[PDB]
Amino acid sequence: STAGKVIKCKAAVLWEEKKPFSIEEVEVAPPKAHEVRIKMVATGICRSDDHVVSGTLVTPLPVIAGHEAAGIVESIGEGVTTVRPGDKVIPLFTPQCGKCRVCKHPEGNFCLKNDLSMPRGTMQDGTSRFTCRGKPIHHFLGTSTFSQYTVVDEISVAKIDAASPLEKVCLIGCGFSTGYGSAVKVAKVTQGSTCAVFGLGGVGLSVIMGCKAAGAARIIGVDINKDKFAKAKEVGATECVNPQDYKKPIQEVLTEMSNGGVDFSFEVIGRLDTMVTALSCCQEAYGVSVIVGVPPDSQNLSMNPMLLLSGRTWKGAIFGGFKSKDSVPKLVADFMAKKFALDPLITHVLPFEKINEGFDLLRSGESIRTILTF
Amino acid sequence: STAGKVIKCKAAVLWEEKKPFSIEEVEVAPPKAHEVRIKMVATGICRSDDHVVSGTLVTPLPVIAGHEAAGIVESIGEGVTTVRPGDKVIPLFTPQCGKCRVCKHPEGNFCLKNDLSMPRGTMQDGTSRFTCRGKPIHHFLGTSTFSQYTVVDEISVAKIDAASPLEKVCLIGCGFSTGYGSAVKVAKVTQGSTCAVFGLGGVGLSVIMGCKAAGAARIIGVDINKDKFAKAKEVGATECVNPQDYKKPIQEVLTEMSNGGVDFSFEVIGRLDTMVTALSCCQEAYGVSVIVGVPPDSQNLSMNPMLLLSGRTWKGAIFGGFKSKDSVPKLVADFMAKKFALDPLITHVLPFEKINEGFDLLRSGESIRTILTF
Numbered sequence: 001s002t003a004g005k006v007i008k009c010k011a012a013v014l015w016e017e018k019k020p021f022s023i024e025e026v027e028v029a030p031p032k033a034h035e036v037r038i039k040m041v042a043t044g045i046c047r048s049d050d051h052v053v054s055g056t057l058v059t060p061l062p063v064i065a066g067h068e069a070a071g072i073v074e075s076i077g078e079g080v081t082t083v084r085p086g087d088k089v090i091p092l093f094t095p096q097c098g099k100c101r102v103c104k105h106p107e108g109n110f111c112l113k114n115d116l117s118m119p120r121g122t123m124q125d126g127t128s129r130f131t132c133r134g135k136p137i138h139h140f141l142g143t144s145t146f147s148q149y150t151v152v153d154e155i156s157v158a159k160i161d162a163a164s165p166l167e168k169v170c171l172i173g174c175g176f177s178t179g180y181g182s183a184v185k186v187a188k189v190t191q192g193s194t195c196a197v198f199g200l201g202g203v204g205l206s207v208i209m210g211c212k213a214a215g216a217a218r219i220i221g222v223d224i225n226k227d228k229f230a231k232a233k234e235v236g237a238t239e240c241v242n243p244q245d246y247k248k249p250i251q252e253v254l255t256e257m258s259n260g261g262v263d264f265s266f267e268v269i270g271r272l273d274t275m276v277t278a279l280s281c282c283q284e285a286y287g288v289s290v291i292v293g294v295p296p297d298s299q300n301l302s303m304n305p306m307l308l309l310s311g312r313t314w315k316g317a318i319f320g321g322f323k324s325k326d327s328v329p330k331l332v333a334d335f336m337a338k339k340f341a342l343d344p345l346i347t348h349v350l351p352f353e354k355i356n357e358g359f360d361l362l363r364s365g366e367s368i369r370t371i372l373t374f
Numbered sequence: 375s376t377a378g379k380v381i382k383c384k385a386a387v388l389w390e391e392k393k394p395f396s397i398e399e400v401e402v403a404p405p406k407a408h409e410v411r412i413k414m415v416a417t418g419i420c421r422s423d424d425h426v427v428s429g430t431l432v433t434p435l436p437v438i439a440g441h442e443a444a445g446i447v448e449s450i451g452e453g454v455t456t457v458r459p460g461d462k463v464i465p466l467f468t469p470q471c472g473k474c475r476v477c478k479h480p481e482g483n484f485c486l487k488n489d490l491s492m493p494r495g496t497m498q499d500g501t502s503r504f505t506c507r508g509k510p511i512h513h514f515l516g517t518s519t520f521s522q523y524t525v526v527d528e529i530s531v532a533k534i535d536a537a538s539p540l541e542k543v544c545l546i547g548c549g550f551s552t553g554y555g556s557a558v559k560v561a562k563v564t565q566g567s568t569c570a571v572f573g574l575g576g577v578g579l580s581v582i583m584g585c586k587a588a589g590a591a592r593i594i595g596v597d598i599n600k601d602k603f604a605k606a607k608e609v610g611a612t613e614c615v616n617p618q619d620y621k622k623p624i625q626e627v628l629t630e631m632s633n634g635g636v637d638f639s640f641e642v643i644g645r646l647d648t649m650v651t652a653l654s655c656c657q658e659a660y661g662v663s664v665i666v667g668v669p670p671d672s673q674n675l676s677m678n679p680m681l682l683l684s685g686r687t688w689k690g691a692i693f694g695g696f697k698s699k700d701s702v703p704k705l706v707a708d709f710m711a712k713k714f715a716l717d718p719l720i721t722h723v724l725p726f727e728k729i730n731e732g733f734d735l736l737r738s739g740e741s742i743r744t745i746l747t748f
């Protein structure tokens with residue numbers, strides 16, 4: 001009924017930094033060859049979307065942000081083979097072209113077709129499917145989920161179980177998969193280990209879930225907002241520490257608590273200082289520290305390389321190291337089989353039109369994930 | 375016959391930074407409980423010893439430096455069980471106590487009894503076995519091999535094969551094992567990989583040996599001294615580049631040569647800028663970079679954590695990640711079985727009393743390893 005036609009629909013457009021989203025009418029072009037137009041069902045509010053508003057994460061403006069979502073295929077362009085109209089889907093902010101040297105590497109997931117390194121804010125063909133006020137509007141990470149309809153490249157969508165609950169599994173589109181994979185795949189957390197997780201938002205709680213799944217003995221949650229601790233303990237933190245309660249810097253506290261440093265630390269905030277602290281608190285000879293947080297654009301940290309010379313490993317990852325199009329349908333199948341939980345991450349549900357209240361809930365410290373329903 | 379007595383002998387004392395070593399008459403105390411007195415047979419001149427002279431590496435002065443050596447046990451203190459008089463030994467600048475959290479960990483080698491992290495320049499008991507005209511002389515990394523005789527803690531010595539040639543296997547006490555293990559144990563270089571090695575001294579040549587042993591298809595040597603390239607190619611470098619030949623940064627050159635980044639990079643110089651260049655030149659999604667070089671004391675590097683967030687792994691190690699007392703004998707056994715060569719590292723052989731000529735050869739760029747013989 002809409003196939004082959006321009007859709008007029010509502011989207012949350014960001015015209016300028018540090019301004020509220022504008023809910024207004026946009027035009028969504030029909031999909032071209034190897035593109036997929038999706039009716040959005042649910043989208044989460046991830047701190048990275050807030051980083052676009054704050055200018056922490058630089059992408060071309062004006063933009064339709066949003067990258068953690070689930071919906072139903074409205075129509076496919078010529079040549080699409082991996083999804084059909086009416087399929088349930090999760091957009092992939094990290095693509096999986098399956099052809100590039102990274103997609104073919106056993107341990108790589110940062111596909112060379114990504115729009116993260118050198119953001120253009122377009123479809124793969126360098127154009128936009130969105131018009132607003134007669135102007136072209138940029139895409140975000142090849143997803144743009146803060147719209148009733150979006151168009152993505154085939155390499156940026158995965159078909160998921162026909163019976164999945166989209167108002168939950170949208171979190172597999174970013175925050176859950178990222179934290180979980182950061183522990184089980186990137187860190188490769190071991191049975192009986194001691195973990196330190198810096199930041200207890202949706203991504204940090206997911207990291208804790210992965211640390212518990214891996215059989216960690218101790219999981220120490222770290223956050224300056226003690227209101228985060230209860231939920232962190234429910235999903236497996238054995239202890240929580242607030243840096244503001246100690247006279248000593250928290251890497252010293254954690255080193256003592258762990259009898260000379262943790263096996264695995266995670267930075268799940270996005271600050272240069274906590275990236276160095278998290279590295280410092282892992283054991284000097286065999287500790288591993290994983291950066292998950294997104295730091296302010298173009299800013300360098302300063303560190304003493306003697307932290308690494310002693311034996312520490314420092315690494316980072318996008319999307320928990322998961323090859324996105326292979327992994328997302330398996331993660332949904334595992335969720336359906338109750339292998340992990342998503343409800344502990346969901347604190348608030350709002351309609352899409354209340355997106356600005358959703359960003360307020362995050363910025364105040366009150367929410368973990370708000371799910372917007374269309 | 376000298377057992378239980380003071381030995382008067384010659385040692386090279388460094389009284390002050392940026393001076394020549396001074397050949398002095400010293401007194402060497404007999405070994406106390408769990409100590410081993412060694413008659414030196416050969417010691418290598420490592421750039422780390424030069425770092426003490428230049429002030430790159432801070433350790434209490436005055437000092438007997440030297441840490442890359444082999445000798446024969448002259449006597450043992452009370453309770454020594456792992457060597458006897460007459461045994462061939464290699465002193466271990468990284469100890470293996472076998473009782474600390476690190477020694478018990480499968481990966482870790484940076485034993486908590488080390489004198490590297492917060493150098494005291496003493497025996498384990500906090501005293502010196504060396505006097506020069508009534509003045510105590512500091513130890514270096516619990517080895518002090520620039521002496522006819524030294525005393526080490528039992529956890530800082532390994533018994534090796536009675537038939538081993540000490541004028542070659544002294545290199546297993548630091549430079550060979552550090553470079554070889556950095557490739558084979560720390561990086562875990564893979565078959566068919568591309569490697570880049572920054573610094574083509576004795577330790578960087580040993581990194582090349584390890585990369586070739588691991589079956590790397592491409593091994594790119596990087597040095598500003600093009601006279602190092604011939605020997606690098608002899609031990610397995612497929613290509614060499616001199617950053618001074620190029621109008622653009624060598625990380626860009628290496629990224630284009632490797633069609634988007636190397637699999638494994640090694641910093642084997644000791645400069646902050648080459649540590650960041652080496653990380654940058656490894657592939658952004660799955661590349662691994664190992665720091666081996668010792669940089670100037672208390673200096674921090676500056677880097678963009680986006681280099682790690684994409685997927686890179688950054689690590690460092692001491693002594694190639696080898697658990698020292700377990701590994702040094704097996705490395706000597708493997709040398710005796712022709713598993714690897716040490717002669718390519720040895721460019722000069724001098725008697726001990728020509729130590730300053732040995733350091734002049736290193737500083738001029740002529741030498742790789744000078745072995746000092748007794």
Ligand SMILES: NC(=O)C1=CN([C@@H]2O[C@H](COP(=O)(O)OP(=O)(O)OC[C@H]3O[C@@H](n4cnc5c(N)ncnc54)[C@H](O)[C@@H]3O)[C@@H](O)[C@H]2O)C=CC1
Nearest residue numbers: 047048178199201202203223224225269270293294318319
């Ligand atoms: N690498 C990747 O693929 C991904 C990265 N991210 C990033 O991960 C980070 C976390 O995302 P969310 O969990 O959605 O964010 P969030 O904003 O819900 O949670 C961050 C937590 O950090 C705490 N915090 C702030 N300053 C702190 C400090 N100094 N010390 C300790 N805790 C502090 C806050 O109280 C908060 O609970 C963000 O930077 C986001 O951009 C998000 C997902 C994917």
Ligand SMILES: NC(=O)C1=CN([C@@H]2O[C@H](COP(=O)(O)OP(=O)(O)OC[C@H]3O[C@@H](n4cnc5c(N)ncnc54)[C@H](O)[C@@H]3O)[C@@H](O)[C@H]2O)C=CC1
Nearest residue numbers: 421422552573575576577597598599643644667668692693
């Ligand atoms: N982590 C560890 O356990 C160990 C660390 N080391 C350290 O490893 C490093 C190398 O030691 P050696 O091989 O004995 O030293 P070396 O001085 O023989 O070799 C260093 C090489 O770096 C090259 N070089 C200097 N500046 C350069 C630049 N800007 N760009 C490219 N090349 C440059 C030199 O021309 C030289 O060939 C030193 O810092 C040393 O202290 C040594 C052994 C053990």
Ligand SMILES: OCC(F)(F)C(F)(F)C(F)(F)F
Nearest residue numbers: 046048057093116174294318
């Ligand atoms: O939240 C996802 C994420 F990886 F952080 C991102 F949004 F893709 C990033 F990296 F911020 F661009």
Ligand SMILES: OCC(F)(F)C(F)(F)C(F)(F)F
Nearest residue numbers: 420422431490548668692693
């Ligand atoms: O060359 C040995 C070495 F590991 F580099 C050292 F000397 F111990 C260090 F690290 F320099 F202190």
Ligand SMILES: [Zn+2]
Nearest residue numbers: 046048174175
């Ligand atoms: Zn996100």
Ligand SMILES: [Zn+2]
Nearest residue numbers: 097100103111
């Ligand atoms: Zn790809």
Ligand SMILES: [Zn+2]
Nearest residue numbers: 471474477485
């Ligand atoms: Zn130990």
Ligand SMILES: [Zn+2]
Nearest residue numbers: 420422548549
């Ligand atoms: Zn050395």
